[PDB]
Design a protein around this ligand. Structure first.
Ligand SMILES: [Mg+2]
Ligand SMILES: [Mg+2]
Ligand SMILES: [Mg+2]
Ligand SMILES: [Mg+2]
Ligand SMILES: [Mg+2]
Ligand SMILES: [Mg+2]
Ligand SMILES: [Mg+2]
Ligand SMILES: [Mg+2]
Ligand SMILES: [Mg+2]
Ligand SMILES: [Mg+2]
Ligand SMILES: [Mg+2]
Ligand SMILES: [Mg+2]
Ligand SMILES: [Mg+2]
Ligand SMILES: [Mg+2]
Ligand SMILES: [Mg+2]
Ligand SMILES: [Mg+2]
Ligand SMILES: [Mg+2]
Ligand SMILES: [Mg+2]
Ligand SMILES: [Mg+2]
Ligand SMILES: [Mg+2]
Ligand SMILES: [Mg+2]
Ligand SMILES: [Mg+2]
Ligand SMILES: [Zn+2]
Lengths: 83, 104, 208, 99
RNA sequence: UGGAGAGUUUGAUCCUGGCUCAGGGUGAACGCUGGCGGCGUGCCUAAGACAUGCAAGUCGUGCGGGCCGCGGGGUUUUACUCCGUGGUCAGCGGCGGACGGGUGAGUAACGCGUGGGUGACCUACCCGGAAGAGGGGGACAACCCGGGGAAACUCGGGCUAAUCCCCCAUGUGGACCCGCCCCUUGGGGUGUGUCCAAAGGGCUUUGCCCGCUUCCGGAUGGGCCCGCGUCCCAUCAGCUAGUUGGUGGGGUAAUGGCCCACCAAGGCGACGACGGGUAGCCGGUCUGAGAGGAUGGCCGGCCACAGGGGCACUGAGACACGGGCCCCACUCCUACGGGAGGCAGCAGUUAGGAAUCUUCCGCAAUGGGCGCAAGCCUGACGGAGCGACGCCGCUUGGAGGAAGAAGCCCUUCGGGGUGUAAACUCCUGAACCCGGGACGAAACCCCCGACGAGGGGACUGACGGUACCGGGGUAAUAGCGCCGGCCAACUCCGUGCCAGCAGCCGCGGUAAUACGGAGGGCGCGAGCGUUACCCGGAUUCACUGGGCGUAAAGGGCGUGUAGGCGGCCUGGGGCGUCCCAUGUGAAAGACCACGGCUCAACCGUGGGGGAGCGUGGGAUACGCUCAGGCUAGACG
């Protein structure tokens, strides 16, 4: 089941995730189908979260199932905001 | 695209199958001289149609037998043993170099 | 860590005079003042014609012993100037001249390079506010290099910034003796520095 | 010891027996049908064909035969039977055979 | 944006030539020495053997029970029995257990790489669309009774639930045979015939949630096939009978000799078959001016394996590391009949070895399985631990301070050196004490709102009282190699071809800058040196870029097969070759830019480059090909 989750790319005590689209069975840091964003849990830079919402929306358009956190970050960048 | 190839039918001895001798050419990776290498494919010819000496186009196909993944797509130019020759003779030399030797 | 040990012996071995002490190195005492010869039991014996190696080795030892730096660091700094565009000889000097401990020294905050190092280490320095105690910190254009407010009362910092009254400063610098500040305007160029060094040699030495 | 998921083996076994039985009926009836048709028995040769067809499609209900495996069987069966009947056949019941 | 050479064959010389060194690198190890921190890394041998703990479970919102307890009922009491409810245990059923983690034994192969093919295929869960869920029957555990066994465990009999299994119905539809049409390998449409569906559960219970069935489509993941690439030996030259092809059949999701019967006699090979050896392959990595050489640990991708061999079962998926059977070996239990095991999972033990760590903390974060959810499991993971194993950062102080203490070394005995070094003065103030104390964590959930969008609320950190901040505050580790030349650094003494050094040339037989110590010096510095291996130097396997009269090197000569190479003019083709566009060339790494941690190491973001191959379009000088012509080669 393809998903939209985070992939650990930081470094010790310096986490930096990559909001990715990957089959559900791969190592969390394994080969992903497509990157679609990143996330700096510690906001160590003005820009600490981006999400190709155009893309997200697409994957969700096809069974992409986001981690609870992955969904959080997404939402937080009007990924679902249907105003 | 299903790879399409060209060659001479050097073998006609089988039923519904022909041996196409596809010649390849390319530069040697380290010495660069262009070198002519080659290989035999057993093309599928259901109607017997193609006879020894023809030049046919071979086309990548669904397996037909072990060691046989090509079908004769079409005839390029009929008859010309001048090519079958090279082949046959080359083989004939083999029939020597080992313990005795092959006539020049 | 850094050399640490009799320093004027280097002054002597290198022939050229190196200012690894600030004061005194001006007084008739840098020893290069009546004793411009190398240390040890052979200092005064005739010198045999140095080998191509010797020359390059010495030239490097010189430049490096100036900024008082570990060959390790020195080398990597070099290899860096090497990759970067621009005449390597220059780029390299520009980089050595960008070490925080160097600037603190080039700004009269400190009497010598060693001392400036310690000031940086004991946190008596500022870099656009935030204090930085990494003597090998790369000071870059625009960076203001202050002095610890807390330290601004320190006799040493006072005496130093005092005599600094009057003294001009490098054209790639500029210091406000009042608030004990100074700005790193631009990477000094080869012409800007007057080091008793032939960097064409230092380059050649790492050629081998 | 005792990785309670022994249960899986436990179950696997039952299923095996279940499947194993399902297929025997299939084969049996299939021959039953082919053999008939062979010796031209039309009417009844098809009657049995149908039951067979059914059992097969049924196996594909669950994970017994499932998929094309079922499809194959059906065609290979109908082929054999329809052909075999060409021995003066005249498919009466027309059973599963399309007129 | 890029390339250094030196020593050594002679009395001397030039050339040839081998050897040797300086450099870079290492999952290292060994020696002397060793202070702090960050990141990273750590069985390279016995794919040897393993104690103990842990490492995959989860659903009571699919079903029925056993046991222990409580409360309330039908009971006048008693017996019996009904309901609710707590605890606990497995059973049935479902999903997961095919991922994640390990290792590299085997494999020279469609294994891997790259680019394609699939009208020859599959894909649980997820997403979109269409339609549906009507009725009936049954069994087996649990439980109960009996039997066998030392045990592991087993056999028989009886009861029962379900989303367990079966039958009939509905046929949206789909499946098969046949016909027809369009398509072109088995793609798609259509007509008759036959065949095939379903299961329930929960409630804030006339609706909403979870779930079930059939079909189509998507998304992801995968099978299979094909072109090209992929080490050494020809002191391996011929290999082959399911072997090569065919017809029919089995088999699978699917093509296929994959398997089988029958038929044919084929298939492969010097462009190196067969055989032997060695080896997982790749992105990369190391070195190099490059070409190239070497390599494939850590990280990511693929493959293979799970004590050795074979086999299937269940399943969407396995031939299934912590599932099954059999054989072998080994180990343990055995009442000797017979049983139980498999750390190449984390940690740990033992053995082997020059050599490789904690039986740690945590589930808080990320990710994974189950669950409506709360939540449970997670040695995956996030962290801490030990080891200078690597990289980067940092300290052992700073300034002053004699024509220059003492000691030690040398002396031409005048003096020279260690050396501003020390002593000493003053300044700062690692360690260390005190106080404050973190980002990483906002979701899931709850409430308003429709369980949507949107808004509010609550819970939650191992690391850790660590990072960091502020106050106080001590001058507070330095070692190792080398000094004949290559090669930076010279003297005295001791020894006397001895003891010893040694990478090569060499040094030592009483004036040794070459041994041993000392003084002094050169180089690096919490490291320094050694050994081992790879690239370099080595244009010393020479494509870039080597040579063969006498240095190593022309075959004893010819005739000639394959192969390599091919005069002048013109035309067609456009295979090579050149160009353009386009797809691919994953991430990581490399390069550039900016950014985050006081810097850097490390890390984040963005950008550019990239051979090779696929597709389309173009060019035609050269090479190829075909055709025509020619006489300058050749032949007559
Ligand atoms: Mg000589
Ligand atoms: Mg030589
Ligand atoms: Mg082999
Ligand atoms: Mg019974
Ligand atoms: Mg219909
Ligand atoms: Mg039915
Ligand atoms: Mg091996
Ligand atoms: Mg080279
Ligand atoms: Mg099955
Ligand atoms: Mg195990
Ligand atoms: Mg967790
Ligand atoms: Mg989780
Ligand atoms: Mg010298
Ligand atoms: Mg002597
Ligand atoms: Mg070479
Ligand atoms: Mg050459
Ligand atoms: Mg030569
Ligand atoms: Mg000779
Ligand atoms: Mg001759
Ligand atoms: Mg020509
Ligand atoms: Mg072309
Ligand atoms: Mg920065
Ligand atoms: Zn001086």
């Amino acid at each position: 089941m393809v998903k939209i989750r985070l992939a650990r790319f930081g470094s010790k005590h310096n986490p930096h995730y990559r909001i990715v689209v990957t089959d559900a069975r791969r190592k969390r840091d394994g080969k992903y189908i497509e990157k679609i964003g990143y996330y700096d849990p510690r906001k160590t830079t003005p820009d600490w979260l981006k999400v190709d919402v155009e893309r997200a929306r697409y994957w969700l358009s096809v069974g992409a199932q986001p981690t609870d956190t992955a969904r959080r970050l997404l939402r937080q960048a009007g990924v679902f905001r249907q105003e | 695209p299903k790879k399409v190839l060209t060659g001479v039918v050097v073998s006609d001895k089988m039923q519904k199958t022909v041996t196409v001798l596809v010649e390849r050419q390319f530069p040697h990776p380290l010495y660069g001289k262009v070198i002519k290498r080659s290989k035999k494919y057993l093309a599928h010819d259901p109607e017997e149609k193609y006879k020894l000496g023809d030049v046919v186009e071979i086309i990548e196909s669904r397996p037909i037998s072990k060691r046989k993944r090509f079908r004769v797509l079409r005839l390029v130019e009929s008859g010309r043993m001048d090519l079958v020759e090279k082949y046959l003779i080359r083989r004939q030399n083999y029939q020597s170099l080992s313990k005795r030797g092959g006539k020049a | 860590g850094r050399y640490i040990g009799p320093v004027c012996r280097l002054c002597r071995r290198e022939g050229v005079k190196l200012y690894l002490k600030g004061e005194r190195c001006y007084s008739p005492k840098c020893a290069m003042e009546r004793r411009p010869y190398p240390p040890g039991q052979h200092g005064q014996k005739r010198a045999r014609r140095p080998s191509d190696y010797a020359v390059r080795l010495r030239e490097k030892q010189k430049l490096r012993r100036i900024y008082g730096i570990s060959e390790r660091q020195f080398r990597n700094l070099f290899e860096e100037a090497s990759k970067k565009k621009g005449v390597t000889g220059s780029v390299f000097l520009g980089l050595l001249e960008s070490r925080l401990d160097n600037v603190v020294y080039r700004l009269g905050f400190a009497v010598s390079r060693r001392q400036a190092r310690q000031l940086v280490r004991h946190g008596h320095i500022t870099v656009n506010g935030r204090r930085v105690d990494l003597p090998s910190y790369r000071v870059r254009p625009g960076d203001e290099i202050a002095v610890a407010e807390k330290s601004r009362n320190l006799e040493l910092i006072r005496q130093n910034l005092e005599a600094m009254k009057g003294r001009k400063v490098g054209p790639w610098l500029s210091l406000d003796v009042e608030g004990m500040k100074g700005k790193f305007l631009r990477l000094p160029d080869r012409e800007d520095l007057a080091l008793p060094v032939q960097e064409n040699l230092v380059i050649e030495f790492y050629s081998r | 010891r005792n990785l309670s998921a022994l249960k899986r083996h436990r179950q696997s076994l039952k299923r095996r027996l279940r499947n194993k039985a399902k297929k025997s009926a299939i084969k049996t009836l299939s021959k039953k049908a082919v053999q008939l048709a062979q010796e031209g028995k039309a009417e009844e040769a098809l009657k049995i064909m149908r039951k067979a067809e059914s059992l097969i499609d049924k196996a594909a209900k669950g994970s017994t035969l499932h998929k094309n495996a079922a499809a194959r069987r059906k065609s290979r069966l109908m082929r054999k039977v329809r052909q075999l009947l060409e021995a003066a056949g005249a498919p009466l019941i027309g059973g599963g055979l399309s007129a």
